[PDB]
Structure formats: C-alpha cells, structure tokens
Design a protein around this nucleic acid. Structure first.
Ligand SMILES: Nc1ccn([C@@H]2O[C@H](COP(=O)(O)OP(=O)(O)OP(=O)(O)O)[C@@H](O)[C@H]2O)c(=O)n1
Ligand SMILES: [Ca+2]
Ligand SMILES: [Ca+2]
Ligand SMILES: [Ca+2]
Length: 341
DNA sequence: GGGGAAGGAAAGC
DNA sequence: GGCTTTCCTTCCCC
C-alpha cells in the first residue's frame, strides 16, 4: 500500500484569507461565539501569525484577546468552509477512485495502483498541491507512507505547506523512537494510562503482557498499537458516509425548566433538519450538557423515518426522561439524528 | 459465550 | 464552542 494523505493548512483561517487577501500576513482568529456574554466562546482555529503566540483551537476567545488584542477576530462561517472543502475534495477524486474523506479538511487516497514507488508518489503529491493551489489558492500538507496512520504522521511532521514520505526504513525507526503520545488515537487520557505502564514508544507494547495492556486501555486500542508496533497495521481506504447529523446550542442561562428549555431544543431541531437535507433519520437523540459540563443523552429508534413533527414531539419526551432521571441543571441542549434510510 | 442495543468515554476536527 | 466517529460497559436474549 502507498497511501497519500492530504490535510489543508490552517483551514478555516486560510479560507477567510482567500476570500479577503488583505488578511494575509496578519494574525487571524476564527471564533465560535456562544452568545452568553461579550466574547464568550472558543477559538475554532487561527492562522500562523496568531498561533505562533499561543492562540490555538479550543482556548477561550477571552484568553486569545488577552494575548493578541489587535488580531482580526472573525466569526466561524462553517457553510463557506464546507463548500470550499467539497470542491477541493472533488479535485482529489481525480487522482484515485479509492478515497476516504476523513473530515472537513482531510482525505486519504490509496495510490497503490497509480504510482510504482515513493519517488512517483512524492511527485504526485506535488502535482496535487499545485492543482489545489492553482484552482482554489489553498495550501495543504501531504503525507505519504505505507498505511493511513503513518501517512498522517508524515503530514504532521511536514506541516504547514509541506510534503513528506516516511519510507519503510523510517517506519521502523519511528516504531522505536516516536513518542507513543504522538500516535493518532492516543489522547491525554490514554497517554496517561500508558505512562502508568512504562510504555512511551510503540515498540514497548510488544513486550508488555497483552492482558495488562488491554485492561488499561481496552482491547481495541491495545490491538491497534500492537499491530502498528509489529508493522502489520492494515486498514483499507474506504468511502465514508455521514452517519449522524445534529446541533447543540448553549442556553442564555442554566435551567431544568421544560418550558424554558423547549425553545432551544426546538431551534436545535429546526437547524438539524436544515442540515439533513433529504436524508431521513430513523433515530433521534436528545443531548444535554449539564451545568458541571457532563454530557447526558436519551434516544429513540423508529421502524420508519422521523418527520419533523415526530422529532418535535419525541424530543420533548426524551428531554423529560433526562430531567426525570438526572438532577443537574442543563447548560446546553440539542439533538442528534442518525440511522438514515 | 457472545451478538445487539443503549448510553457513556475518548478522540480528532 | 461545537460536530462526528468509534470503542467501552451493561444488560437482554439466543
Ligand atoms: N478543536 C478544533 C480543532 C479544529 N477545528 C477546525 O477544523 C479545521 C482543521 O483542523 P486542524 O487541522 O486541527 O486545524 P488547522 O487550523 O487546519 O491547523 P493546521 O494548519 O496546523 O493543519 C480548522 O480549520 C478548524 C475546530 O473547529 N475545533
Ligand atoms: Ca489533521
Ligand atoms: Ca488542517
Ligand atoms: Ca496525542
């Protein structure tokens, strides 16, 4: 397998720069304003100019402003970024019929039948970068390797606006030298459970007793890491299809008053249906984030499609279930639809 | 013993 | 902040 992974640079911020070139060279911060108060909300992402100083995805808009008070703060325009992403994805389809669109700004291409070696793979990578630059003036990073995990790691090592090949020789080196925390799928919590074990390199997962590993991080993640460490990881590139669509909104103030919560729940339903666009869900879940920030959900699956009227009435019953079973107040409220016909 | 369904955990975008 | 996917735990049932 020769996998070519594409990851768009500072995506949301870059799109804003393409639509407004005068932004080039200035720190730009794309924000998710929640509406609770002046600047409440978080940073979706920021371009290099702002990230260099610590303004990154996830931090409070308020903290970003403390760091860079004169940066350009822009509201997230997800619909615009999605449309631009879709066009780039269409360009990528032209280089291989085996394409896995992983997120709003990533895609894996199995170019095994397209190139003979990594030299050719690398050249195709340049061709792809130039094609996207020519057509949408968007820069991206290309990672190439023998499988999806290392192709992604290669891009991580090369961003931004880069391209890198991790050949077989280097894959073996990385299995030995790469911090296991930097392996896709290992977040802070798993990285912590692993440390508890002496494991901080993939290679270390081979000598530890499987059951010990499995009991700490779970069977799936254990087998995953071990397969990688043995250099036997094999996962085909496959067409992905959305499985769920939803919307969650933050309420002006916390509450567990049904009538006070309904307008938000209903608004969330309306927007979710907008997004479904022709897809008919058979399952609906009401999702609530409590005052202490926990997430609670109650759902229902129907033997048929869910009409918006049915979504409205069932959502109330589910929310009622949440209120009848959980004592905490609610901060955010929303819905999630799945099991499309 | 183990698959399926519901709800929570964890991860990355 | 807020969107989506995948795996885990618990319990029902064959
Ligand atoms: N917590 C996060 C992480 C990412 N994103 C958004 O998802 C897109 C890209 O994911 P990511 O690769 O993490 O952000 P980039 O800004 O593109 O960073 P880079 O240039 O380093 O690839 C971004 O444009 C933004 C988000 O809303 N919230
Ligand atoms: Ca990425
Ligand atoms: Ca990116
Ligand atoms: Ca990590």
């Amino acid at each position: 397998m020769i996998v070519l992974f594409v990851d768009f640079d500072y995506f949301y911020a870059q799109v804003e720069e393409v639509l407004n070139p005068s932004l080039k060279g200035k720190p730009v911060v794309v924000c998710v304003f929640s509406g609770r108060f002046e600047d409440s909300g978080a940073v979706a992402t920021a371009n290099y100019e702002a990230r260099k100083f610590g303004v990154k995805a996830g931090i409070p808009i308020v903290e970003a402003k403390k760091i860079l008070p004169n940066a350009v703060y822009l509201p997230m325009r997800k619909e615009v970024y999605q449309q631009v992403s879709s066009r780039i994805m269409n360009l990528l389809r032209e280089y291989s019929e085996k394409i896995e669109i992983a997120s709003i700004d990533e895609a894996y291409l199995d170019i095994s039948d397209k190139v003979r070696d990594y030299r050719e793979a690398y050249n195709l990578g340049l061709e792809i970068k130039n094609k996207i630059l020519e057509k949408e003036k968007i820069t991206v990073t290309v990672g190439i390797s023998k499988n999806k995990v290392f192709a992604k790691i290669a891009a991580d090592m090369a961003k931004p606006n880069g391209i890198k090949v991790i050949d077989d020789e280097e894959v073996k080196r990385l299995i030995r030298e790469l911090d296991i925390a930097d392996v896709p799928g290992i977040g802070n919590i798993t990285a912590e459970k692993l440390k508890k074990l002496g494991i901080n390199k993939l290679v270390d997962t081979l000598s530890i007793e499987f059951d010990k590993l499995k009991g700490m991080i779970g069977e799936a993640k254990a087998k995953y890491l071990i397969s990688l460490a043995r250099d036997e990881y094999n996962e085909p590139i496959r067409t992905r299809v959305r499985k769920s669509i939803g919307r969650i909104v933050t309420m002006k103030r916390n509450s567990r008053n049904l009538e006070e919560i309904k307008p938000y729940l209903f608004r969330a339903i309306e927007e979710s249906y907008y997004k479904l666009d022709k897809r008919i869900p058979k399952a609906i879940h009401v999702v609530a984030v409590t005052e202490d920030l926990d997430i609670v959900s109650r759902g229902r699956t129907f033997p048929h499609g869910i009409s918006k009227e049915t979504a409205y009435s069932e959502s109330v019953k589910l929310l009622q279930k949440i209120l009848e079973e959980d004592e905490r107040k609610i901060r955010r409220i929303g819905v999630r639809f799945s099991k499309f016909i």
